Amino acid sequence: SDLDVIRQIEQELGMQLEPVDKLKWYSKGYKLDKDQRVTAIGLYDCGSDTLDRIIQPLESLKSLSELSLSSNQITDISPLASLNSLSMLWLDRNQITDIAPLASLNSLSMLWLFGNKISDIAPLESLKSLTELQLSSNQITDIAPLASLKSLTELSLSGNNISDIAPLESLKSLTELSLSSNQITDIAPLASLKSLTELSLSSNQISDIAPLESLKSLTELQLSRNQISDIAPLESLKSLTELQLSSNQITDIAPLASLKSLTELQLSRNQISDIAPLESLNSLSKLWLNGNQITDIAPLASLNSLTELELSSNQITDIAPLASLKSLSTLWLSSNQISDIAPLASLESLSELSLSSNQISDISPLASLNSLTGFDVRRNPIKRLPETITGFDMEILWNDFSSSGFITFFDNPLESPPPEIVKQGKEAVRQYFQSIEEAR
Amino acid sequence: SDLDVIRQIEQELGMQLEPVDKLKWYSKGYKLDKDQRVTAIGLYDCGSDTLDRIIQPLESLKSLSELSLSSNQITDISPLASLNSLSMLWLDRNQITDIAPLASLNSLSMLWLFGNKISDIAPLESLKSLTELQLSSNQITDIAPLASLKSLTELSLSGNNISDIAPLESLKSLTELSLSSNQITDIAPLASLKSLTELSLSSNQISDIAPLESLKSLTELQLSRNQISDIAPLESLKSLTELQLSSNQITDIAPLASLKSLTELQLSRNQISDIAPLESLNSLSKLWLNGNQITDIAPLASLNSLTELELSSNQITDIAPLASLKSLSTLWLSSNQISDIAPLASLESLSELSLSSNQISDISPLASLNSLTGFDVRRNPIKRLPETITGFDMEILWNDFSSSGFITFFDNPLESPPPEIVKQGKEAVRQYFQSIEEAR
């Protein structure tokens, strides 16, 4: 019986396989049917020999529909050609170069081949029932074979060597597509994939994103590390909640003004000065604007849903517009031109704050923020600490890095408690102040 | 006119005062009446001299009801007695020791005296119009004088030398009370204060919290750093939204199971091993459980509102129960016994992850987590990095600390890309993998 074969496999491998209701790629188990027949088997992370040692036991399981051999570093998958009943196959995280044996698996609807050494995907042309296909982190350049797979809905091809994506043009049922870390410049073939909901294109050489304009079902779009300066095409993508545009050449963000469903926006390492277009984005909870040319941040005042805000490496001076942000929990302001941090004392939800590499002399206003669990004040001209610094429940560190749960000093020209006291920790600082209070 | 008197103050002190629509404690300016009259003035951070020099101009402002002398290092406030119609006064962050002059200000409704050197508060007895009073960070032991201030709604007494709090029993209109960092043991007198919605008693010597039993309107309660072992009195506090119980002596959290309004819960540094009672806390978003004796984590699987989860320093091996948590974005798992993170591949919203000091060798399961902006894998037996390690929107560091924006390695026995190449950065790592592809 099918269960007796499980016993043989267990015995041959010297391991234990357990029943599950749903086979997962990392499963070390099997699934049984209402007739006690093995419909699935997972042999995740058993060894490179695994396929060789138990091919026959697998061949004798006739209702076997799902097989995982993830994370075995298997180099030869020739034996699998026998198993033409398979509809789901996990071969990710192996050492496969030749996938010719997989052309025999005519009933495959789900295939995972992440993290192998594949260049030729000609053998996949005949697998028309495929709906989910993972080919990321291989060595693929030619994706012509994919033009036949018209029932594909999820396709991953990130981390290959692809420049030509024209073969995807007729894959109109595709809703999730990953194409990051490739050699892509022309994305015109994507203009026809109108039911895409998630698209990733980061680390390519895209300049012209005009073809994205019609892709109105997009909710999630990754475009970081490209050569994009013109984002006018994005204006029409009204369903977007998550948008990543870091490491581009953007100056004008006016087309984002209308993207009212955005909750997460990353615009790091561009050349933005004017952020006036962000004032209407009232659902924005996470905003990354680090590494730009910003000085005026008045437009952020009305963004009351903001819980996380990265503004480090700009030229900001006046931070009073942030005073309204009641829900702000994490604020990064490193490497700006700030001198006065008094208005930050109204940030009632603030827990993590970095003010390093500014020109701040007086941090006494921070004493009111009992909510703070960590803050960073390295490289500021602070000379005297107020007694109220012991009122926080965080240890004090002297290091050149930020750390949560701690107050961090470095290269501050401290005089009142001088550095020699501060380097000793929270208790030394308390006793310093205590020894001069009790003598008063 | 009033505007001329402002010009007089500006000349005398040699500064600018600007109109404001509302006076804040840190304001350098004034608010004007409908009839061009000054009803509010702020002289924040001018100097210890300031009060003596402009008291007379302040006397001529007949409609003045709000004054800020915050952060001036004032030593004596005698001249203030001349002002009658003040209803709001900020004197925080000075060097006040004697507050007798405040007794004459009968119409005071708001008084801030945070961060001074006050020990005698007898002068406040007569100020029975006070609703908000801030006395944190002073040298107060005896709070008998407050007993008659029955109009108080907000009181702060944190950072003082208080052990006896019986005088607070009569203050039944109190909605907010802060008593953190004192010498309190007996909180019996708080049982009478049934309109309290916010209470802080952190850093005391409290053991018996039975007196909290009847405080049914409590929504925020901070009891961290005490000697609490029995938390059954919290069982009936159904309106509780945030609860902090870190650094106590708690083992049995069964009483928490009925607190279904809880969204933030901190139980760090206790002796908990069984977290089954959290299972029904379905609104829980932030959960801190670090520094306990947890091994089994299965009760977290149904907590689908979780966005932030702190599980460092326990004895966890199996991470599979986290797989379901699709909203989880921050996850701390440092110092456990984890050897496999395959189940974390399903954490689509994950953006900050710490895995340091564990037994993990394969970090490839994270490859398709495209919104990871920070991850830490110091002190794990990682020998071989996956190619996709360079694919993230994250730089690579070899450094003995975690940092947002970066992938951080330290004390990893790396072979494939050796430590030396990894410390050169992201592109050197990319160059290493590329040379191998094109040679083979």
Side-chain angles (χ1 to χ4, degrees), chain A residues 1-6 8-35 37-278 280-439, chain B residues 1-6 8-35 37-439:
Chain A
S1 66
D2 285 12
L3 222 179
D4 287 66
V5 183
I6 298 290
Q8 293 177 348
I9 292 165
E10 283 183 37
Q11 196 76 99
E12 169 57 14
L13 296 169
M15 74 183 286
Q16 296 152 30
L17 300 168
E18 302 294 353
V20 289
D21 290 317
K22 188 174 163 278
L23 214 273
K24 290 199 167 64
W25 68 271
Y26 54 86
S27 299
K28 303 195 184 224
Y30 57 90
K31 190 206 161 56
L32 296 177
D33 195 10
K34 295 177 184 183
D35 299 299
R37 284 222 157 77
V38 169
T39 56
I41 195 167
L43 302 168
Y44 152 80
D45 191 28
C46 297
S48 61
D49 50 55
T50 309
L51 177 59
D52 290 353
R53 291 187 188 180
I54 49 63
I55 179 66
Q56 297 95 327
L58 286 176
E59 285 163 328
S60 64
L61 297 167
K62 302 287 178 175
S63 304
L64 193 260
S65 189
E66 308 175 3
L67 173 65
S68 174
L69 290 161
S70 168
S71 315
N72 285 303
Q73 315 309 297
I74 291 162
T75 170
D76 171 39
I77 55 157
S78 165
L80 295 170
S82 328
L83 312 172
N84 54 260
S85 290
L86 293 175
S87 58
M88 296 186 174
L89 183 59
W90 289 272
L91 284 168
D92 55 288
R93 295 164 183 83
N94 283 298
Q95 295 287 127
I96 304 157
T97 313
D98 180 39
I99 50 159
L102 303 176
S104 311
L105 309 189
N106 53 72
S107 287
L108 280 182
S109 62
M110 197 239 80
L111 216 208
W112 270 31
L113 288 160
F114 167 94
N116 287 284
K117 301 186 167 180
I118 303 161
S119 48
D120 183 14
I121 55 162
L124 304 181
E125 280 213 32
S126 78
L127 310 184
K128 266 90 193 312
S129 287
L130 283 178
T131 61
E132 187 184 333
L133 178 53
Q134 235 298 345
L135 281 170
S136 53
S137 198
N138 284 277
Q139 311 169 157
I140 303 169
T141 310
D142 187 15
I143 60 168
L146 298 184
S148 319
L149 308 181
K150 302 203 187 160
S151 56
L152 275 177
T153 63
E154 307 168 38
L155 175 62
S156 320
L157 287 160
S158 289
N160 282 285
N161 304 317
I162 299 160
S163 66
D164 190 12
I165 59 163
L168 306 183
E169 190 168 24
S170 62
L171 301 192
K172 297 173 179 173
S173 290
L174 225 41
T175 68
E176 305 171 25
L177 174 59
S178 306
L179 287 164
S180 56
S181 310
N182 280 286
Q183 244 65 46
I184 297 168
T185 305
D186 187 28
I187 63 167
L190 302 185
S192 53
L193 308 178
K194 291 167 188 180
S195 43
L196 281 174
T197 63
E198 306 170 21
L199 173 58
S200 57
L201 284 161
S202 302
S203 305
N204 281 297
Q205 293 102 289
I206 297 163
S207 170
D208 173 29
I209 56 160
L212 303 185
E213 186 280 333
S214 70
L215 304 186
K216 193 166 167 217
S217 289
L218 285 175
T219 68
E220 191 179 318
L221 177 66
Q222 328 285 145
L223 285 172
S224 65
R225 301 174 48 88
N226 280 293
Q227 301 176 32
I228 301 160
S229 62
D230 182 24
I231 48 155
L234 295 181
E235 183 181 8
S236 54
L237 304 186
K238 299 275 194 292
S239 290
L240 284 172
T241 65
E242 181 181 328
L243 172 57
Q244 157 80 108
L245 281 158
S246 297
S247 287
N248 275 295
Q249 305 172 10
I250 294 159
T251 288
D252 185 8
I253 55 165
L256 302 184
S258 47
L259 304 187
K260 294 177 194 307
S261 299
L262 277 176
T263 63
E264 170 170 331
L265 175 58
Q266 297 205 44
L267 286 159
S268 314
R269 301 190 187 267
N270 286 279
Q271 295 280 287
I272 296 160
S273 305
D274 185 17
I275 57 160
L278 303 192
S280 61
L281 304 187
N282 297 290
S283 297
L284 220 49
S285 74
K286 180 169 170 194
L287 176 58
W288 281 49
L289 289 162
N290 57 298
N292 282 284
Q293 301 287 292
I294 298 166
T295 60
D296 183 17
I297 60 164
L300 302 178
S302 352
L303 274 32
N304 292 298
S305 306
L306 277 178
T307 63
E308 185 178 315
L309 182 60
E310 231 302 10
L311 284 165
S312 72
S313 299
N314 286 289
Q315 303 95 244
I316 297 164
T317 287
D318 179 15
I319 56 179
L322 303 179
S324 31
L325 308 179
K326 286 178 190 178
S327 293
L328 191 66
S329 186
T330 299
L331 177 54
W332 287 287
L333 282 166
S334 300
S335 305
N336 275 290
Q337 295 279 271
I338 293 153
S339 289
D340 182 27
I341 54 83
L344 301 183
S346 34
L347 299 173
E348 63 198 22
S349 299
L350 191 66
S351 57
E352 289 180 82
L353 172 66
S354 176
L355 300 165
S356 59
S357 301
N358 285 295
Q359 188 61 12
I360 295 159
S361 57
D362 186 350
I363 64 162
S364 180
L366 299 188
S368 305
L369 301 181
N370 45 265
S371 174
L372 283 177
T373 59
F375 63 97
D376 179 30
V377 289
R378 298 173 285 129
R379 290 180 183 75
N380 286 274
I382 299 160
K383 284 172 162 49
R384 312 180 76 267
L385 301 176
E387 190 267 347
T388 52
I389 193 172
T390 50
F392 296 115
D393 261 289
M394 290 97 79
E395 183 55 50
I396 292 164
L397 289 162
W398 196 278
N399 303 320
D400 202 10
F401 54 83
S402 68
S403 198
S404 55
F406 300 89
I407 301 173
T408 303
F409 294 92
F410 197 84
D411 194 6
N412 300 284
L414 288 164
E415 297 179 2
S416 186
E420 19 279 304
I421 299 298
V422 185
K423 290 169 154 80
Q424 292 171 215
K426 198 206 307 220
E427 284 306 317
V429 176
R430 183 176 281 94
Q431 289 167 25
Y432 169 96
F433 280 111
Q434 196 192 28
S435 72
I436 67 183
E437 170 60 22
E438 78 189 5
Chain B
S1 74
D2 280 6
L3 285 172
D4 291 333
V5 175
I6 288 156
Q8 180 184 3
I9 287 165
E10 290 173 321
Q11 286 165 17
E12 178 56 32
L13 305 168
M15 75 176 60
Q16 186 175 205
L17 275 70
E18 314 186 336
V20 306
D21 301 305
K22 191 180 203 163
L23 205 79
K24 314 288 184 177
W25 69 265
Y26 53 79
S27 310
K28 300 198 194 221
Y30 57 97
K31 201 205 88 192
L32 276 186
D33 219 328
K34 225 153 290 191
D35 305 287
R37 266 206 155 92
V38 170
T39 58
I41 187 168
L43 302 166
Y44 165 75
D45 193 21
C46 300
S48 54
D49 223 346
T50 189
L51 179 54
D52 299 328
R53 299 183 64 169
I54 47 64
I55 181 57
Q56 333 81 289
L58 285 178
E59 290 174 6
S60 63
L61 297 170
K62 293 174 179 183
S63 302
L64 198 273
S65 54
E66 315 180 4
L67 211 197
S68 179
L69 286 162
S70 173
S71 312
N72 282 304
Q73 311 293 257
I74 294 171
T75 203
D76 169 71
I77 51 162
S78 170
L80 287 177
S82 308
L83 300 158
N84 264 12
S85 53
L86 289 192
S87 44
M88 301 184 182
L89 181 59
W90 291 272
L91 281 167
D92 58 292
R93 280 166 272 238
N94 288 293
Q95 297 292 348
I96 298 163
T97 236
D98 180 23
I99 56 171
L102 288 154
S104 58
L105 311 180
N106 286 115
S107 263
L108 272 182
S109 215
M110 193 229 67
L111 180 53
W112 272 49
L113 288 163
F114 172 84
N116 283 288
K117 300 184 159 174
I118 297 162
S119 59
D120 186 356
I121 60 172
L124 303 179
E125 289 179 33
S126 48
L127 307 178
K128 299 184 188 161
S129 299
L130 285 177
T131 67
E132 174 176 0
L133 174 62
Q134 228 289 4
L135 284 171
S136 295
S137 291
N138 277 292
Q139 293 296 334
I140 298 166
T141 304
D142 180 7
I143 58 169
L146 304 174
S148 49
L149 309 180
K150 294 177 186 187
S151 295
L152 285 174
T153 61
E154 301 184 12
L155 180 58
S156 305
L157 287 162
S158 296
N160 284 116
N161 308 314
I162 306 170
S163 67
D164 185 6
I165 57 156
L168 302 174
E169 174 158 24
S170 57
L171 308 183
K172 291 144 191 289
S173 301
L174 234 35
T175 64
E176 304 181 12
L177 181 59
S178 304
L179 289 161
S180 48
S181 295
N182 281 291
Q183 251 68 245
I184 299 160
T185 286
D186 177 25
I187 58 167
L190 302 179
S192 336
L193 310 189
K194 295 196 191 67
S195 56
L196 283 174
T197 70
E198 298 182 25
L199 174 62
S200 300
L201 292 164
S202 301
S203 301
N204 282 279
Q205 303 154 52
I206 300 166
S207 224
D208 181 20
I209 53 158
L212 303 188
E213 212 165 43
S214 53
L215 305 191
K216 234 292 209 297
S217 298
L218 230 34
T219 63
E220 306 181 12
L221 174 67
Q222 307 180 334
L223 283 165
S224 292
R225 281 160 259 102
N226 279 291
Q227 294 156 39
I228 301 165
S229 292
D230 175 22
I231 60 175
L234 304 180
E235 219 255 38
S236 53
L237 305 183
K238 300 300 197 288
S239 296
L240 272 178
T241 270
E242 97 179 39
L243 176 58
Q244 292 168 54
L245 280 164
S246 297
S247 297
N248 275 291
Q249 301 162 353
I250 296 154
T251 296
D252 186 354
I253 53 167
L256 297 182
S258 26
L259 307 191
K260 298 176 199 310
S261 294
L262 276 178
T263 58
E264 295 183 24
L265 177 62
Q266 302 189 36
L267 296 156
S268 306
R269 304 172 185 195
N270 278 281
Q271 277 90 37
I272 302 160
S273 79
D274 178 15
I275 60 161
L278 304 178
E279 179 187 327
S280 66
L281 304 181
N282 282 285
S283 293
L284 212 55
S285 174
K286 298 181 166 180
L287 176 60
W288 290 53
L289 287 164
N290 52 306
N292 277 290
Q293 278 128 19
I294 299 165
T295 61
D296 185 4
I297 218 79
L300 303 186
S302 54
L303 302 185
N304 298 298
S305 282
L306 283 170
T307 66
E308 186 179 288
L309 187 59
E310 165 55 277
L311 286 162
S312 308
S313 302
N314 287 294
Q315 299 142 47
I316 299 162
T317 296
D318 179 17
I319 229 67
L322 308 192
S324 37
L325 311 178
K326 291 168 66 140
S327 288
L328 192 64
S329 52
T330 297
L331 173 61
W332 293 290
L333 284 166
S334 295
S335 306
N336 277 286
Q337 300 162 38
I338 304 163
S339 63
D340 194 322
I341 56 161
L344 305 187
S346 50
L347 297 184
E348 68 196 49
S349 302
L350 189 69
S351 58
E352 161 162 354
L353 173 68
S354 187
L355 294 174
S356 52
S357 293
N358 277 285
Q359 305 167 26
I360 301 158
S361 52
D362 185 6
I363 64 174
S364 68
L366 303 171
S368 291
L369 301 184
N370 49 64
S371 64
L372 265 179
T373 52
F375 89 72
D376 181 26
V377 290
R378 294 172 293 148
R379 304 191 172 78
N380 276 272
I382 297 173
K383 309 149 77 183
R384 183 185 150 252
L385 301 188
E387 260 117 66
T388 47
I389 197 72
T390 57
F392 298 94
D393 291 308
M394 283 185 284
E395 199 66 24
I396 296 169
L397 300 168
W398 186 274
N399 270 312
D400 206 323
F401 56 86
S402 74
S403 189
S404 54
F406 300 88
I407 301 169
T408 53
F409 294 101
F410 197 90
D411 263 320
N412 306 282
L414 287 174
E415 300 160 346
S416 184
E420 280 81 52
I421 293 178
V422 173
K423 38 196 138 196
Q424 308 200 58
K426 185 199 179 90
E427 292 311 324
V429 169
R430 182 184 262 103
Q431 284 159 222
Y432 169 87
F433 287 114
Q434 281 172 344
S435 67
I436 292 165
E437 190 197 348
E438 67 186 30

Short mmCIF file of all heavy atoms in Angstrom, two decimals, chain B residues 21 23 40 55 59 71 84 94 131-132 152 173 203 213 237 242 280 287 326 335 349 368 372 391 423:
data_model
loop_
_atom_site.label_atom_id
_atom_site.label_comp_id
_atom_site.label_asym_id
_atom_site.label_seq_id
_atom_site.Cartn_x
_atom_site.Cartn_y
_atom_site.Cartn_z
N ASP B 21 -1.04 81.78 16.43
CA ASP B 21 -2.46 81.50 16.56
C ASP B 21 -2.73 80.76 17.86
O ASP B 21 -3.80 80.91 18.45
CB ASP B 21 -2.96 80.68 15.37
CG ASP B 21 -2.73 81.38 14.04
OD1 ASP B 21 -3.18 82.53 13.88
OD2 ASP B 21 -2.09 80.77 13.15
N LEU B 23 -0.41 79.62 21.55
CA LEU B 23 0.83 79.60 22.31
C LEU B 23 1.18 78.18 22.73
O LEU B 23 0.36 77.48 23.32
CB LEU B 23 0.75 80.50 23.55
CG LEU B 23 2.12 81.00 24.04
CD1 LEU B 23 2.58 82.17 23.18
CD2 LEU B 23 2.09 81.40 25.50
N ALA B 40 -1.85 86.20 25.36
CA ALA B 40 -0.84 85.15 25.57
C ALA B 40 0.54 85.62 25.12
O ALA B 40 0.65 86.32 24.12
CB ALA B 40 -1.23 83.89 24.81
N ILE B 55 8.84 92.11 33.90
CA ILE B 55 7.66 91.97 34.76
C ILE B 55 6.71 93.16 34.62
O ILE B 55 5.49 92.98 34.54
CB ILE B 55 8.02 91.71 36.24
CG1 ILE B 55 6.75 91.56 37.09
CG2 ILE B 55 8.91 92.81 36.81
CD1 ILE B 55 5.81 90.47 36.62
N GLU B 59 2.82 93.40 33.45
CA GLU B 59 1.74 93.96 34.27
C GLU B 59 0.81 94.87 33.47
O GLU B 59 -0.38 94.96 33.79
CB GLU B 59 2.30 94.73 35.47
CG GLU B 59 2.94 93.85 36.54
CD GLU B 59 3.62 94.65 37.64
OE1 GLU B 59 3.49 95.89 37.65
OE2 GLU B 59 4.28 94.04 38.51
N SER B 71 12.33 76.92 30.29
CA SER B 71 13.74 76.75 29.94
C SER B 71 14.57 78.03 30.01
O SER B 71 15.48 78.25 29.20
CB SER B 71 13.85 76.14 28.55
OG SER B 71 12.99 75.03 28.43
N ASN B 84 -2.34 88.62 37.96
CA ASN B 84 -3.55 88.11 38.63
C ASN B 84 -4.37 87.15 37.80
O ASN B 84 -4.71 86.07 38.26
CB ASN B 84 -4.44 89.28 39.06
CG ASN B 84 -4.23 89.69 40.50
OD1 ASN B 84 -3.27 89.26 41.15
ND2 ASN B 84 -5.13 90.51 41.01
N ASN B 94 13.39 75.30 34.58
CA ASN B 94 14.13 76.37 35.24
C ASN B 94 14.94 75.79 36.40
O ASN B 94 15.31 74.62 36.37
CB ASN B 94 13.15 77.46 35.67
CG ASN B 94 12.61 78.24 34.49
OD1 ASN B 94 13.36 78.96 33.83
ND2 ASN B 94 11.32 78.11 34.22
N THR B 131 -6.67 72.23 37.06
CA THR B 131 -7.10 70.96 36.49
C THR B 131 -5.92 70.14 35.95
O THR B 131 -5.94 68.91 36.02
CB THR B 131 -8.12 71.16 35.35
OG1 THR B 131 -7.47 71.80 34.25
CG2 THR B 131 -9.29 72.02 35.83
N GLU B 132 -4.91 70.82 35.42
CA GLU B 132 -3.69 70.18 34.90
C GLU B 132 -2.47 70.70 35.66
O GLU B 132 -2.22 71.91 35.67
CB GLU B 132 -3.56 70.46 33.40
CG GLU B 132 -2.26 69.98 32.75
CD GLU B 132 -2.23 70.21 31.25
OE1 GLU B 132 -3.21 70.75 30.69
OE2 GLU B 132 -1.22 69.86 30.61
N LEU B 152 -8.44 68.73 39.96
CA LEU B 152 -7.39 68.13 39.12
C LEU B 152 -7.89 66.96 38.26
O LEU B 152 -8.50 66.03 38.78
CB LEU B 152 -6.21 67.65 39.97
CG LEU B 152 -5.25 68.70 40.53
CD1 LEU B 152 -4.25 68.04 41.46
CD2 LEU B 152 -4.53 69.43 39.41
N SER B 173 -11.68 63.27 40.28
CA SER B 173 -11.84 63.69 38.88
C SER B 173 -10.60 63.41 38.00
O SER B 173 -10.57 63.78 36.83
CB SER B 173 -12.23 65.17 38.82
OG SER B 173 -13.44 65.36 39.51
N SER B 203 8.91 51.71 37.40
CA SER B 203 10.10 51.98 38.24
C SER B 203 9.75 52.39 39.67
O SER B 203 10.19 53.43 40.16
CB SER B 203 10.99 53.04 37.59
OG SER B 203 11.42 52.60 36.31
N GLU B 213 -7.89 46.83 40.72
CA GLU B 213 -9.04 45.99 40.36
C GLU B 213 -10.27 46.72 39.84
O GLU B 213 -10.86 46.31 38.85
CB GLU B 213 -9.46 45.18 41.59
CG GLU B 213 -10.02 43.81 41.30
CD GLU B 213 -10.07 42.96 42.55
OE1 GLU B 213 -10.46 43.51 43.61
OE2 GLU B 213 -9.69 41.78 42.49
N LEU B 237 -10.07 44.63 33.82
CA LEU B 237 -9.78 45.89 33.15
C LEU B 237 -10.00 45.75 31.64
O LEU B 237 -9.05 45.85 30.85
CB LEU B 237 -8.35 46.34 33.46
CG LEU B 237 -8.02 46.46 34.94
CD1 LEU B 237 -6.60 46.99 35.13
CD2 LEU B 237 -9.02 47.35 35.67
N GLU B 242 -3.36 49.47 25.82
CA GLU B 242 -1.92 49.23 25.93
C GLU B 242 -1.54 48.89 27.37
O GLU B 242 -1.99 49.54 28.31
CB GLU B 242 -1.12 50.41 25.37
CG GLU B 242 -0.63 51.43 26.39
CD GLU B 242 0.18 52.54 25.76
OE1 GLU B 242 -0.17 52.99 24.64
OE2 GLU B 242 1.17 52.97 26.40
N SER B 280 -6.31 34.38 22.19
CA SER B 280 -7.57 35.07 21.89
C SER B 280 -7.45 36.60 21.82
O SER B 280 -8.47 37.29 21.74
CB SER B 280 -8.60 34.70 22.95
OG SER B 280 -8.23 35.21 24.22
N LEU B 287 3.69 43.27 20.18
CA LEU B 287 3.86 42.31 21.24
C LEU B 287 5.34 42.13 21.53
O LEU B 287 6.11 41.73 20.65
CB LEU B 287 3.25 40.97 20.83
CG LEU B 287 3.41 39.79 21.80
CD1 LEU B 287 2.78 40.11 23.14
CD2 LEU B 287 2.78 38.55 21.19
N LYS B 326 0.66 37.79 7.94
CA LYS B 326 0.88 38.53 6.69
C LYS B 326 1.07 40.03 6.87
O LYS B 326 1.54 40.71 5.95
CB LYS B 326 -0.27 38.26 5.71
CG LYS B 326 -0.27 36.84 5.17
CD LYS B 326 -1.55 36.49 4.42
CE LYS B 326 -1.71 37.30 3.15
NZ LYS B 326 -2.26 36.48 2.03
N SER B 335 19.05 35.66 19.62
CA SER B 335 19.33 34.82 20.80
C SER B 335 18.24 33.78 21.09
O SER B 335 17.52 33.85 22.09
CB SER B 335 19.61 35.71 22.01
OG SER B 335 20.63 36.64 21.70
N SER B 349 4.87 41.25 4.19
CA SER B 349 5.01 42.64 4.67
C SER B 349 6.26 42.88 5.53
O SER B 349 6.40 43.96 6.10
CB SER B 349 3.76 43.06 5.45
OG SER B 349 2.60 42.94 4.66
N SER B 368 12.82 36.42 -1.88
CA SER B 368 11.70 37.10 -2.53
C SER B 368 10.92 38.06 -1.61
O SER B 368 9.84 38.53 -1.98
CB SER B 368 10.75 36.07 -3.17
OG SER B 368 11.37 35.45 -4.29
N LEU B 372 12.05 44.08 2.39
CA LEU B 372 13.07 44.02 3.43
C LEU B 372 14.04 45.19 3.28
O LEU B 372 14.81 45.24 2.32
CB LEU B 372 13.88 42.72 3.36
CG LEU B 372 13.48 41.51 4.22
CD1 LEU B 372 14.44 40.37 3.91
CD2 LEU B 372 13.52 41.84 5.70
N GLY B 391 20.40 41.41 -4.26
CA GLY B 391 19.21 41.82 -5.01
C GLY B 391 18.30 42.79 -4.27
O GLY B 391 17.43 43.41 -4.88
N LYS B 423 33.18 42.49 3.35
CA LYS B 423 33.40 43.82 3.96
C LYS B 423 33.75 44.92 2.95
O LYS B 423 33.66 46.10 3.29
CB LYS B 423 34.41 43.82 5.14
CG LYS B 423 35.64 42.92 5.06
CD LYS B 423 36.27 42.77 6.45
CE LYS B 423 36.72 41.34 6.74
NZ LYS B 423 36.97 41.12 8.19
#
